[PDB]
Amino acid sequence: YFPLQSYGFQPTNVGYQPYRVVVLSFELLHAPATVCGPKKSTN
Amino acid sequence: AYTNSFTRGVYYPDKVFRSSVLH
C-alpha cells in the first residue's frame, strides 16, 4: 500500500460522484452549555 | 532518581457536584 490516492470526480458519473459530508458531533457534558436550540428563557 | 507519590494525583472524575457520599 502507498500513502495517498486521488478521486476521479468527473461530471459524467451516481454513487461514483463526489458527496460532501458534515458530521455534527454534540458535546453533551456536565460542563456549562454554549450551543443551544432557540428557546426563550422565562423568569 | 525516584520518589514515593503517596496519595497524590487524584482528580474530579466528572463535573457533577456530590457531597457527604462515597463514589
Side-chain angles (χ1 to χ4, degrees):
Chain A
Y1 180 65
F2 296 94
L4 290 176
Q5 290 74 39
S6 61
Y7 287 120
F9 297 146
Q10 290 177 348
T12 54
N13 290 359
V14 178
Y16 298 92
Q17 294 178 7
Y19 278 58
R20 283 185 182 200
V21 50
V22 175
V23 182
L24 297 181
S25 180
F26 298 152
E27 194 174 284
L28 291 158
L29 287 179
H30 25 62
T34 87
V35 184
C36 300
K39 202 171 188 166
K40 297 181 182 178
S41 58
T42 66
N43 193 25
Chain B
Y2 295 83
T3 196
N4 191 336
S5 64
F6 308 104
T7 61
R8 288 287 119 169
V10 182
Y11 58 80
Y12 288 88
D14 51 13
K15 312 189 188 187
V16 172
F17 180 92
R18 300 187 185 84
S19 61
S20 304
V21 74
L22 311 179
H23 181 62

